[PDB]
Amino acid sequence: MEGLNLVATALAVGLGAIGPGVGIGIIVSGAVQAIGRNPEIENRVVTYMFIGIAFTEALAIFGLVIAFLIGFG
Amino acid sequence: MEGLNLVATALAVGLGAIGPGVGIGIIVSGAVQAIGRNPEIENRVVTYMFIGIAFTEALAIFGLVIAFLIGFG
Amino acid sequence: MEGLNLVATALAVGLGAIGPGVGIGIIVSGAVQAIGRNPEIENRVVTYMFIGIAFTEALAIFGLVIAFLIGFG
Amino acid sequence: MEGLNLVATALAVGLGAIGPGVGIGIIVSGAVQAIGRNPEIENRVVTYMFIGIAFTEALAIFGLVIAFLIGFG
Amino acid sequence: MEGLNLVATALAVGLGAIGPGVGIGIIVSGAVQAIGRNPEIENRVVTYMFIGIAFTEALAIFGLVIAFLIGF
Amino acid sequence: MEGLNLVATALAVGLGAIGPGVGIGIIVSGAVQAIGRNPEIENRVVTYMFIGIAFTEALAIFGLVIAFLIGFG
Amino acid sequence: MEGLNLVATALAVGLGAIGPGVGIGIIVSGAVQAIGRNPEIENRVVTYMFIGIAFTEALAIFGLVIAFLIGFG
Amino acid sequence: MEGLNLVATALAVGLGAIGPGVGIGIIVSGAVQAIGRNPEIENRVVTYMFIGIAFTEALAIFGLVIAFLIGFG
Amino acid sequence: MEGLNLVATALAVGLGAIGPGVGIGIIVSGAVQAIGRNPEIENRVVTYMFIGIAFTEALAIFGLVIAFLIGFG
Amino acid sequence: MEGLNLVATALAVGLGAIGPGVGIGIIVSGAVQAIGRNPEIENRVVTYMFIGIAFTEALAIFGLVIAFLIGF
Amino acid sequence: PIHLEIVTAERVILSDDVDMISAPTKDGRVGILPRHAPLMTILEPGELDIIKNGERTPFAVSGGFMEVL
Amino acid sequence: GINPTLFIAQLINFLLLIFILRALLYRPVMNLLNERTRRIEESVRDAEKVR
Amino acid sequence: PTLFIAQLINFLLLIFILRALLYRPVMNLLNERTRRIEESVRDAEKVR
Amino acid sequence: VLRRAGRFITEQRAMGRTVDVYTFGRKGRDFFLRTGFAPAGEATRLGDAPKLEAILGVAISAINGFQSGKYDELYIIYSEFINTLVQRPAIKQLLPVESPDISTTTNVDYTYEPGEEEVLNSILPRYVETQIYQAVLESIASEHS
Amino acid sequence: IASRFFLYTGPPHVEVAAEVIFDGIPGFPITNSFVVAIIIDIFVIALAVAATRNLQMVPRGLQNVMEFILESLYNLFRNINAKYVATAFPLVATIFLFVLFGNWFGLLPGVGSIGVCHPLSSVAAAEGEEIHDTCAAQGKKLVPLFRAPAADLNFTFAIAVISFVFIEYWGFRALGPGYLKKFFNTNGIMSFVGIIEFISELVKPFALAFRLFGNIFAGEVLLVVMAFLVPLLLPLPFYGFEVFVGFIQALIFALLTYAFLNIAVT
């Protein structure tokens, strides 16, 4: 009734961290396997993987900033 | 109920980070594995990766728009 | 007691973004893996990739239509 | 309390998007990978992929129809 | 409170969609891969494939069944 | 309240569908791939597959039985 | 309320189906694939398979007996 | 409202068993695959297998003991 | 509600032992598959495995600590 | 509605354990598999493995820090 | 403690004990240690390295096969 | 729509449609068999004439 | 009732567009199959 | 060796199966150009120390003919070296059988990195090529003797 | 292109209801789906008669399309099992054709528009319009005379029951008393597997009928909701997906029936 904003912030952060964590996990696993298989193609690989970790993290941050709008404001 | 409005935005953004985050993660993992296996097919790999990333991020865009509509009214 | 439907709206988007997009990502992974080994088969497999993407997007559209229905009565 | 029907509709639709979406993604990725690694067998592989997609989509439509019955019954 | 039967039916049907859906997806992917590797045995495996789906379908049907037991 | 038993039975059956369903899906996919790789040992692995199914479905059966008890007394 | 015991035992049995069900599925798929690859060591891994099976079953049994303590009170 | 502790015990055993069970299944599958690949390192694999199992069991042990602390004083 | 404490403790433990268990299982399976081939790296990867195992335990123990912070104030 | 903050803390810490835990498991398994296949590239691999583990722990610690802010 | 039998269709190249070897396999470079599991390998044109006791000798190959016992 | 009479009528209609389809497919199977036999006979006659 | 009329008009237009788009490749496949069937029939007739 | 080749060709033609010839060396090439049907593939001017790339052309031509259905069987005829005094024509079936299966179970769980099918499809032509190379080297030693 | 999506002519709401009983002036009352099924059967019979009346070498026209469809269906059925490729072709082919016709009838104009009854009017600043229907008077609901035949549970249940009965009869034709030996054989752990297989076989026709009816009803409801959302040009991809899915489900039903017959045989 009165503690719903705390629950909203907690749920927002937890659900924004539960998904992108697995996303960056599989990104890193795939990038590592590609690096081990072909070290000569590393450069593009690195850029692409960072682009990947640019995307999902931002989504998580979006959830976080949404919680930042929920806890305060 | 006094609350049940911050929780809506929280859940929406959290699950819209759950879905598209893991989707983009798998996209990037597969794309980087294909890049490591095949270097000179990079153009079509990048194009299809961007297409899949946009199609997966459409759901996150919908979730963010719905959350903004709920928060603003 | 009154705003629950708004939370429902979030669900009608939120979980609706979990299944398709991840599956979409999975599809893209398979698709890009199919181009990591067999370049010339792209015309055969991109159509099926688009079919699967469209089916997952149809599930997402079902979720969005339900969100619109429960967001306006 | 008051709007439990809309919450039930949203939950059913969201879960029906969660499950069969991942199922369709796995089916399409496997089919596309197998066609890429075997370009002379798709004549029945595509049909088998379509019937598996039909099963998963039937489950999704089960969820959608039950949600519709809750919302209009 | 309102009717919890609607929520029960929704949850049951939704989870019956989640579980057997992913099960059928995995089954179909594995069967397609095996057919693409060794087509000469395809009939055998496709028979087994359908068997698997049947069980998953039954589970989903089971949920729908109890959903009807909550519907009326 | 009033629908607590119905919600309990529904949740039990749904969880016993999500767990054992994916379990038997993995069982069948692995068994089919192993049979495709080695048709000579098929009988043995088929029996093992059935044994695994005869376990996994049993768990689901238990859940259904438990739900029926909650449905009856 | 007066129905929380039914919800408790139902959720306990359902999650005991969720966990060990997927564990059994993965165990059986891996054991069957390895046996199909190499039947000569088959019996040995079968023992370990059963050992793993037992451990997973043990977890289910634990949940079940807790539900038993919820079944009678 | 006095039956919430039973639901707490049920959740603590159930969700505390769904995690280690899947991990145990994956551990056993990987161990059996390694035995298929290299039986001579088999014993060493088996040793590490128990260690992994123990860690999962440790979590399961936790998922039991605090549950009793929820069931009892 | 008066009974929200213990349930929260349960929600601190049960939800805290899902992901760590799967991570432990995946880590041990990966280490076992990497010890099947080139066991002369048996030290190094296991050391990395230990690093990984600690991280997983860290997350798990965090929940347990929070559980105690909910268990006794 | 007393005790709601405890439920919030539990939910946040549980989800932050579930997600990044599986991420850490996947990262470590993939890295050790790559090292087992290619021990020569291990020095180039371990840095990126730590980067991924750092990102996963960053998400989990976001969850834990928001839980700490909620509790106090 | 594994003797590397690098043999060509015309002549034997090397038959000495080697403690560390790489392999330009068609699905990623593989480093084989003296305890490695049995394996069959197809080699695309690459660069095999012999690192017996820290030897680190480059050795260009233009494809072939590898059997690991 | 929950009644036994409607189900019985629908089952009767389905049985009639099944009989009609059975006759229709019994015709095409015989037509295909006759066509295959004629093609085989023509090929055999052509080979015999060439020899 | 202009609402149902507009819904039916939109459905008919979309169905016609999708039917034409699908039937173009469907007509190509049907023409190829008819050519193959006529080739087999002409092969039997030419054998006789 | 030419008498053995003629006997083998006549015996196969008695069974009704058509016969094509691939020739290593000038003498067999001239003989089969004179006495009848021309050889599909010719590889002459091989030195006393030939490389496998010299016989690669004829070997891969035979492999492509077999795998495309042009040839249903393959045989080799070579001067087998017994000792320094006597050496004799010898005929070997290489490609049809192509299964030098071991009596015992020496194979212990070989993991095929590109798969069993790819490893087989890349190792069968190399086995045929090295069999032909060994036959050519044996024939060269027998010619010198 | 992005400025012609006017919403001044849209449905007031979305009419989602179960099977509607027709007036039925004489005895044995019929439903709205029964008339649509009868019309679809009449059209199918007319097409079959047109194809059969002109049958010769080198087919062209509708006969060529019918022959191509029959050849594709025969190839698909023989890819599974050649023992009953011609014996089981009739029921599966008829069910597939009827399902395809019923699915295509749902996209025709007038579905949910004609009411048998046994811009200013639109609300401003709203995503959906509020235009009243013609049969809104006298407290009616504008009962749809035209509807998808597969959108009714009776036809789907009858088709599923007939397919299950045909499969059971074909299995009992020449298999001996193998059902008893396969179900609850009391041989170790095979009894539980046989019981589960028997339960799955019993629930398969209900699953198929529910899947078909739900798919048709959900397609109709999604089309209605998309029309209510925007008057035109929005639902084109959804309509194309529904059109593809109708044929996909029509083929899938026959494929599933053939697969069930093969599994009962083997």
Question: What is the secondary structure of I27-72 as a DSSP string?
Answer: HHHHHHHHHHS-GGGHHHHHHHHHHHHHHHHHHHHHHHHHHHHHH-
H, E, C per residue of chain C:
CCCHHHHHHHHHHHHHHCHHHHHHHHHHHHHHHHHHHCCCCHHHHHHHHHHHHHHHHHHHHHHHHHHHHHHCC
CB contact under 8 A, L15 and O162: yes
What is the C-alpha separation between J11 and J19, in angstroms, rounded? 12
CA distance to D14, J49, M3, M10, per residue, from O228 (Å):
22, 51, 8, 11
Q: Which residues fall within 8 angstroms of residue G23, CB to CB, at 6 or more apart? A: F23, G52, G56, G59, H21, H22, H23, H24, H25, H28
Q: Are I28 and G30 in contact (CB under 8 A)?
A: no
Q: Which of J62, C30, J11 is nearest to A57 (CA)?
A: J62
Angle between helices J42-71 and I42-71 (to 10 degrees): 0
Burial tier of K12 (Cβ tally within 10 Å: 0-12, 13-18, 19+): exposed
Q: Which residues of O touch C72 (CB under 8 A)?
A: 126-128
Q: In A12-72, where do the E strands start and end?
A: none
Q: Which residues of H touch N109 (CB under 8 A)?
A: 36-39
Task: Compute φ and ψ for N114, nearest 5 degrees.
Answer: -85, 5
Q: Are A27 and A53 in contact (CB under 8 A)?
A: yes
Burial tier of J47 (Cβ tally within 10 Å: 0-12, 13-18, 19+): exposed
Instruction: Among G1, G41, G67, select the one facing H1 at the smallest CB separation.
Output: G1
How much is the CA Rg of chain M, to the nearest whole Å?
Answer: 20
What is the C-alpha separation between G20 and G55, in angstroms, rounded? 9
- L23: its two tokens: 């006759």
Minimum distance, in Å, between the CA of residue O266 and any CA atom of chain E: 8
Q: Are O68 and M40 in contact (CB under 8 A)?
A: no
CA distance to I70, O53, O93, O252, per residue, from O65 (Å):
72, 15, 15, 20
Which of K26, K27, K29, K30 to probe by mutation at the A interface, max A CB count within 10 Å?
Answer: K29
Chain J residues within 8 A (CB-CB) of chain I?
1-4, 6-7, 9-11, 13-33, 35-37, 39, 42, 46, 49, 53, 56-57, 60, 64, 67, 71
CB contact under 8 A, H29 and G27: yes
Which residues pair with residue N43 across a beta bridge?
Answer: N24
Length of chain C in residues, anyone?
Answer: 73
Which of K19, K21, K22 to probe by mutation at the J interface, max J CB count within 10 Å?
Answer: K22
Q: How many CB atoms lie within 10 A of CB A43?
A: 8
Q: Are A27 and A47 in contact (CB under 8 A)?
A: no
CB contact under 8 A, C65 and O229: yes
Q: Which of B23, A13, B50, A8 is nearest to C18 (CA)?
A: B23
Minimum distance, in Å, between the CA of residue O176 and any CA atom of chain D: 31
- The amino acid that residue O7 corresponds to is L
Q: Are N25 and N41 in contact (CB under 8 A)?
A: no
End-to-end CA distance of chain A: 18
Q: Which residues of G touch H38 (CB under 8 A)?
A: none
CA distance to F11, F49, H48, O246, per residue, from O32 (Å):
38, 48, 68, 20
What is the C-alpha separation between I53 and I28, in angstroms, rounded? 9
What is the C-alpha separation between F31 and G26, in angstroms, rounded? 11
Q: Which of O254, O256, O259 is nearest to O90 (CA)?
A: O254
Q: Which residues fall within 8 angstroms of residue O189, CB to CB, at 6 or more apart? A: F50, F51, F54
Which of A32, A33, A35, A37 to probe by mutation at the K interface, max K CB count within 10 Å?
Answer: A37
Q: Which residues fall within 8 angstroms of residue A30, CB to CB, at 6 or more apart? A: A49, B28, B29, B30, B32, B33, J30
Which residue has 């505390």 as its token pair? Answer: H16
Please report the sign of the dihedral spanned by the C-alpha atoms of residue A40, residue A44, residue A49, residue A53: positive
Which of D18, D35, D64 to probe by mutation at the C interface, max C CB count within 10 Å?
Answer: D18
CB contact under 8 A, E43 and O199: no
Q: How many CB atoms lie within 10 A of CB K9?
A: 13
Chains E and J touch (3+ CB pairs under 8 A): no
CB contact under 8 A, O90 and L25: yes
What is the C-alpha separation between C45 and D28, in angstroms, rounded? 10
Burial tier of N76 (Cβ tally within 10 Å: 0-12, 13-18, 19+): buried
Q: What is the DSSP letter of B73?
A: -
Minimum distance, in Å, between the CA of residue K17 and any CA atom of chain B: 32
Which residue has 């695994």 as its token pair? Answer: F52
CA distance to L34, L46, L47, L51, M44, per residue, from L41 (Å):
10, 9, 10, 15, 9
Angle between helices O153-173 and O190-229 (to 10 degrees): 150
What is the C-alpha separation between E28 and E56, in angstroms, rounded? 12
Length of chain J in residues, anyone?
Answer: 72
If phi > 0 it is left, if psi is from -120 to 50 it is alpha, else beta; for residue F3 that is alpha
Q: Which residues of A touch J68 (CB under 8 A)?
A: none
- L27: its two tokens: 């015709």
Q: Which residues of L touch M43 (CB under 8 A)?
A: 39
Which of D1, D6, D37, D42 to probe by mutation at the C interface, max C CB count within 10 Å?
Answer: D6
Q: Which of D21, M9, N52 is nearest to O232 (CA)?
A: M9
CB contact under 8 A, B1 and A2: no
Minimum distance, in Å, between the CA of residue A73 and any CA atom of chain J: 15
Q: Which residues of J touch I2 (CB under 8 A)?
A: 2-3
What is the C-alpha separation between D25 and C60, in angstroms, rounded? 13
Q: Is O185 helix (H, G, I), strand (E, B) or coil?
A: coil
Minimum distance, in Å, between the CA of residue G32 and any CA atom of chain H: 9
Q: Which of J44, O240, E58, H52 is nearest to A38 (CA)?
A: J44
H, E, C per residue of chain D:
CCCHHHHHHHHHHHHHHHHHHHHHHHHHHHHHHHHHHCCCCHHHHHHHHHHHHHHHHHHHHHHHHHHHHHHCC
Pairing of strands K2-7, N41-43: unpaired
Chains N and H touch (3+ CB pairs under 8 A): yes
Instruction: Among E16, E26, E41, select the one facing F29 at the smallest CB separation.
Output: E26
What is the C-alpha separation between O118 and O137, in angstroms, rounded? 13
Which residues pair with residue K43 across a beta bridge?
Answer: K25, K64
CB contact under 8 A, O48 and L7: no
Q: What is the DSSP letter of F12?
A: H
Contacts 24+ apart (CB under 8 A), N10-13: none
Q: Are D38 and C37 in contact (CB under 8 A)?
A: no
Which of H15, H50, H53, H59 to probe by mutation at the I interface, max I CB count within 10 Å?
Answer: H59
> Resolution (in Å) of the shown entry?
2.9
Alpha carbons within 13 A on the beta-carbon side of E60:
37
Q: In chain K, where do the E strands start and end?
A: 2-7, 12-18, 24-25, 28-29, 39-45, 48-50, 57-59, 62-68
Residues 28-67, chain K, touching A (beta carbon < 8 A): 28-29
What is the C-alpha separation between J60 and I62, in angstroms, rounded? 10
Which residues pair with residue N91 across a beta bridge?
Answer: N77
Minimum distance, in Å, between the CA of residue K26 and any CA atom of chain J: 13
Q: Are D39 and C44 in contact (CB under 8 A)?
A: yes
Pairing of strands K28-29, K24-25: antiparallel
Q: How many CB atoms lie within 10 A of CB B22?
A: 29
Task: Compute φ and ψ for K32, nearest 5 degrees.
Answer: -100, 130
Q: Are G22 and H23 in contact (CB under 8 A)?
A: no
Structure obtained using: cryo-EM
- G72: its two tokens: 């009678």
Q: Does K26 touch chain A (CB under 8 A)?
A: no
CB contact under 8 A, E51 and O210: no
Question: Which helix (H) or strand (E) segment is N92 a member of?
Answer: strand N87-93
Q: Which of O54, N65, N18, J2 is nearest to A7 (CA)?
A: J2
Q: In O5-73, where do the E strands start and end?
A: none
What is the C-alpha separation between O126 and C64, in angstroms, rounded? 17
Chain E residues within 8 A (CB-CB) of chain O?
43, 46-47, 50-51, 54-55, 57-58, 60-61, 64-65
Pairing of strands N41-43, N22-24: parallel
Alpha helix stretches (DSSP H) within E1-72:
4-37, 42-71
CB contact under 8 A, B16 and C20: no
Chain N residues within 8 A (CB-CB) of chain K?
51-52, 108-114, 118-119, 122-123, 126, 129-130, 133
Q: Angle O99-E68-E28 (CA atoms, 0-180°, nearest 5)?
A: 55
Q: Which residues of N touch K40 (CB under 8 A)?
A: 110-113, 119
Angle between helices C4-14 and B42-72 (to 10 degrees): 180
- B31: its two tokens: 């794309």
- N128: its two tokens: 């045929």
Q: Which of A24, J21, D14 is nearest to B11 (CA)?
A: D14
Which residues pair with residue N23 across a beta bridge?
Answer: N42
Q: How many CB pairs under 8 A join D and O?
A: 41
H64 to chain G: nearest residue by CA?
Answer: G62
K24 to chain J: nearest residue by CA?
Answer: J38
Minimum distance, in Å, between the CA of residue F73 and any CA atom of chain E: 15
Q: In chain H, where do the E strands start and end?
A: none
Which residues pair with residue K39 across a beta bridge?
Answer: K68, N111
